[PDB]
Amino acid sequence: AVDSKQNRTSDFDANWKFMLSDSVQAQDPAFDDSAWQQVDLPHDYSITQKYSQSNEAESAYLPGGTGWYRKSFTIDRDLAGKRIAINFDGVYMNATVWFNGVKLGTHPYGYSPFSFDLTGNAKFGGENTIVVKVENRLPSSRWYSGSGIYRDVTLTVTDGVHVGNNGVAIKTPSLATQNGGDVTMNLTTKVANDTEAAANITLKQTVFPKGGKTDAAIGTVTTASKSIAAGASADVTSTITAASPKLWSIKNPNLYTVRTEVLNGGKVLDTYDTEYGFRWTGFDATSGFSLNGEKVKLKGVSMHHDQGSLGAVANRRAIERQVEILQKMGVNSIRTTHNPAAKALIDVCNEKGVLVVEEVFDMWNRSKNGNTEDYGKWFGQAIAGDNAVLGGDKDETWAKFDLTSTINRDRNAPSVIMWSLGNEMMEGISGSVSGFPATSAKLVAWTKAADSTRPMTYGDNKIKANWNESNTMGDNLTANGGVVGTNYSDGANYDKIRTTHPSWAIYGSETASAINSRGIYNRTTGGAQSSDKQLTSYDNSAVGWGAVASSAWYDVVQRDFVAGTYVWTGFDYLGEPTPWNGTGSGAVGSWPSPKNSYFGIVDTAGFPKDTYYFYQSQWNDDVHTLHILPAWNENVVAKGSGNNVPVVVYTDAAKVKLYFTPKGSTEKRLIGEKSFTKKTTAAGYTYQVYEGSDKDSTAHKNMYLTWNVPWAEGTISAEAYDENNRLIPEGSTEGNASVTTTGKAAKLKADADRKTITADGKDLSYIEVDVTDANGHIVPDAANRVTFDVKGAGKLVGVDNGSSPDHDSYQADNRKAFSGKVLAIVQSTKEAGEITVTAKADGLQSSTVKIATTAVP
Numbered sequence: 001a002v003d004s005k006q007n008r009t010s011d012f013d014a015n016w017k018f019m020l021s022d023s024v025q026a027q028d029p030a031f032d033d034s035a036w037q038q039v040d041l042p043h044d045y046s047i048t049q050k051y052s053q054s055n056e057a058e059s060a061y062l063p064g065g066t067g068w069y070r071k072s073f074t075i076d077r078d079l080a081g082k083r084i085a086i087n088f089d090g091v092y093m094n095a096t097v098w099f100n101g102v103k104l105g106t107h108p109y110g111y112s113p114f115s116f117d118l119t120g121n122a123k124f125g126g127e128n129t130i131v132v133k134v135e136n137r138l139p140s141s142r143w144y145s146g147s148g149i150y151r152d153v154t155l156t157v158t159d160g161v162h163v164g165n166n167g168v169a170i171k172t173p174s175l176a177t178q179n180g181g182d183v184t185m186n187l188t189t190k191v192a193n194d195t196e197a198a199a200n201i202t203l204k205q206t207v208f209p210k211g212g213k214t215d216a217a218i219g220t221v222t223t224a225s226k227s228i229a230a231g232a233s234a235d236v237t238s239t240i241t242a243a244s245p246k247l248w249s250i251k252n253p254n255l256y257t258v259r260t261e262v263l264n265g266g267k268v269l270d271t272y273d274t275e276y277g278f279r280w281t282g283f284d285a286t287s288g289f290s291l292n293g294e295k296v297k298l299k300g301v302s303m304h305h306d307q308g309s310l311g312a313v314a315n316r317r318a319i320e321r322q323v324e325i326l327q328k329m330g331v332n333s334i335r336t337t338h339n340p341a342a343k344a345l346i347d348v349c350n351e352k353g354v355l356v357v358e359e360v361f362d363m364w365n366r367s368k369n370g371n372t373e374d375y376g377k378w379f380g381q382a383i384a385g386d387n388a389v390l391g392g393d394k395d396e397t398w399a400k401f402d403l404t405s406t407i408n409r410d411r412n413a414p415s416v417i418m419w420s421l422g423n424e425m426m427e428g429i430s431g432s433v434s435g436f437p438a439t440s441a442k443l444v445a446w447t448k449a450a451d452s453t454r455p456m457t458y459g460d461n462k463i464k465a466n467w468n469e470s471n472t473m474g475d476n477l478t479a480n481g482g483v484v485g486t487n488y489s490d491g492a493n494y495d496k497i498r499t500t501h502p503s504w505a506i507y508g509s510e511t512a513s514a515i516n517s518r519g520i521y522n523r524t525t526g527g528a529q530s531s532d533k534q535l536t537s538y539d540n541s542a543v544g545w546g547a548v549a550s551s552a553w554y555d556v557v558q559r560d561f562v563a564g565t566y567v568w569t570g571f572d573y574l575g576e577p578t579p580w581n582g583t584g585s586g587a588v589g590s591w592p593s594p595k596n597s598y599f600g601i602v603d604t605a606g607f608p609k610d611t612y613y614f615y616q617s618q619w620n621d622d623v624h625t626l627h628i629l630p631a632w633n634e635n636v637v638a639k640g641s642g643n644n645v646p647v648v649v650y651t652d653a654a655k656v657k658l659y660f661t662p663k664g665s666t667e668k669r670l671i672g673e674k675s676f677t678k679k680t681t682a683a684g685y686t687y688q689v690y691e692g693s694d695k696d697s698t699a700h701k702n703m704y705l706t707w708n709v710p711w712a713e714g715t716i717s718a719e720a721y722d723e724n725n726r727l728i729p730e731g732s733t734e735g736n737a738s739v740t741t742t743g744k745a746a747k748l749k750a751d752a753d754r755k756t757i758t759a760d761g762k763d764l765s766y767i768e769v770d771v772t773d774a775n776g777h778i779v780p781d782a783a784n785r786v787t788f789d790v791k792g793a794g795k796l797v798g799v800d801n802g803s804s805p806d807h808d809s810y811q812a813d814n815r816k817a818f819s820g821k822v823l824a825i826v827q828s829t830k831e832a833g834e835i836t837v838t839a840k841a842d843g844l845q846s847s848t849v850k851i852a853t854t855a856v857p
């Protein structure tokens with residue numbers, strides 16, 4: 001039901017029909033879809049299919065296939081004479097779009113946004129059917145991609161004379177020197193005349209705080225009359241003098257709305273808004289990164305797009321929760337490995353104050369890892385002349401279209417600081433690489449012309465291998481205001497890059513790739529396939545090309561010229577289950593094989609691994625950290641020489657005293673005391689390393705503290721002390737400041753992260769359930785199967801435990817805990833009410849939580 005009550009751009013997610021089938025031909029309006037599934041977008045049709053060992057480990061053993069989406073809807077007669085378009089933020093992949101039986105075009109890339117005009121084929125005042133065919137033919141990805149319309153879809157309805165799609169670009173070239181006073185904004189606006197008569201228009205533009213009223217504007221302008229021929233467009237340039245704009249920053253992410261009205265006479269024809277923030281950056285070859293004139297270390301993570309048990313679905317609350325968990329770790333930046341983010345993530349980062357390195361491509365013109373259906377099939381092909389897809393430039397290759405489409409979408413987003421043009425473009429491919437520098441220069445030229453305001457970059461793993469191609473490409477980046485990302489350099493190679501390429505501004509575009517499970521303590525070693533399909537939680541386990549967390553951070557924190565780090569990864573993701581990876585078919589190890597990653601600091605369910613608190617101790621200057629591993633039950637610890645257990649403390653404290661309290665005692669005994677040394681770089685960054693007589697001989701391991709404690713039932717506890725040898729007040733210190741021997745599992749403890757959510761059929765409530773003993777201590781290895789009974793105005797949409805080899809259905813109402821924890825994800829309906837969730841487990845006390853849902857005004 002499409003009419004004039006809708007906003008100019010309106011949500012089009014509701015009430016689609018879906019069918020998985022590679023034989024059906026369902027483009028015609030009269031096709032009978034009465035037996036098809038009924039779904040709301042966003043939607044992922046891989047995540048509900050069964051695991052199969054004849055699929056590929058790298059994409060989580062889940063199939064893709066051909067999916068059809070249909071939606072029949074009325075276009076009211078009050079929209080006659082208006083322009084109508086449908087906008088896709090992402091469809092994975094190989095979309096074909098028909099409207100009322102007429103093929104509109106196609107779009108290969110699964111991660112870039114695109115649109116189609118519907119006006120030409122619309123039945124105004126009648127029934128209409130839009131149809132999307134999706135062909136995710138495997139193999140197409142080095143990770144789990146998902147399949148389908150996994151991001152939001154909207155409708156755009158405008159007057160015949162209107163601002164174009166993504167039609168306003170904003171530059172503040174003098175912001176760094178004008179800051180504090182009047183700031184010049186240079187705007188360019190595309191105005192299209194899609195009528196059959198000449199138009200003469202003016203623009204009224206207004207900049208006012210986001211969510212505020214226009215009378216709080218900090219600047220306005222009205223332009224002179226502009227003539228636009230019928231069926232043509234014009235670019236209208238204008239200048240706004242913004243009166244003392246608030247800067248956008250990590251701490252204070254102030255946002256503005258920039259509103260453009262197209263006027264004919266005194267009547268508004270079209271109103272187009274774009275979100276904006278005032279900020280400037282710099283990358284210096286010697287001193288690194290700065291935001292708004294102040295030095296900032298990029299403390300970043302790489303993040304794949306999926307949302308755990310939800311699959312690829314770009315649910316806004318799921319994405320927001322990820323960012324919130326990362327911020328709590330001290331993360332201030334995200335690299336969207338290796339593809340454009342959902343706009344929802346860009347929205348969140350604009351609002352939260354998180355810097356985004358938005359990467360556009362993984363491979364370029366050569367497919368990777370035998371994935372013959374990946375984007376390397378399409379990167380260099382032309383766009384057919386009858387393909388009416390819209391979003392970016394269509395005059396060269398798909399790569400240019402997809403790159404400019406992404407830049408057009410996000411060019412005004414203050415959170416985005418760099419455009420990353422590729423990742424390890426020469427890794428895992430066949431043929432010569434001699435043409436790759438020329439491809440790189442072409443991408444750099446396109447980017448610089450599409451957006452002069454931000455550096456372009458890439459993530460190159462051949463700089464450490466001294467490939468001449470990397471020298472050429474890095475110089476070409478540098479010659480165009482770009483910044484060079486090196487993948488998996490160590491301290492010595494950072495120094496070699498600085499010596500060999502003194503003109504480059506560099507950063508660690510991908511680092512670490514430590515591999516750990518959550519809650520595994522009976523060995524401190526890893527880096528390879530184990531006997532239990534899990535990996536140690538100690539930070540001693542990494543892939544051969546990577547480095548443990550303390551090593552990759554130690555090498556970055558010391559060097560002001562390494563602007564920052566993008567740790568692989570912030571969250572575990574589906575697929576790439578290294579060291580159980582497989583780029584071909586077949587189970588890796590005994591089935592069920594590990595099907596999600598072990599790289600994440602946080603698991604797929606949002607539950608942090610122990611190294612989360614090492615990073616928090618290093619990165620979060622707004623909280624204190626005091627965290628002990630391992631959990632202190634005899635059957636989970638590792639007994640080495642002398643039956644001693646290695647005890648690790650992550651903390652930002654200056655000094656720690658370790659204690660032991662035997663079970664049944666209330667009196668603790670001092671067992672150790674260690675003090676950090678404070679280091680300061682030339683730029684003023686600080687960090688702590690242990691330099692005591694029993695320090696580790698491997699320097700980077702001294703960014704934390706280790707004791708060897710004999711096993712005995714009781715409690716290990718730690719006290720934090722500051723530089724003055726005074727006790728640190730409890731406050732809001734995070735982590736396990738003590739570990740203690742538990743009893744047997746007795747009860748469940750369920751808690752919803754948000755007790756009230758929006759009744760829009762989108763918002764989510766995340767319910768963590770712990771298996772604990774009778775005194776509330778989590779049983780560290782508990783794997784009890786927990787069943788969720790969801791009643792009321794909501795639906796269970798996912799269950800998760802983060803365990804890589806668990807093939808139980810994400811859509812079941814039950815799942816085993818892993819390392820004491822399990823997750824349920826409930827979604828609201830479109831009616832306000834109450835959701836009651838009861839978590840049950842055999843032999844244990846149940847736990848019930850209640851969640852209110854609130855109607856949309």
Ligand SMILES: OC[C@H]1O[C@@H](O)[C@H](O)[C@@H](O)[C@H]1O
Nearest residue numbers: 423424461487510513543568
């Ligand atoms: O360690 C695994 C990672 O290795 C990197 O070299 C690659 O860019 C990532 O996408 C991921 O595969």
Ligand SMILES: [Ca+2]
Nearest residue numbers: 139369370583
């Ligand atoms: Ca493959």
Ligand SMILES: [Ca+2]
Nearest residue numbers: 620621623652
């Ligand atoms: Ca801190």
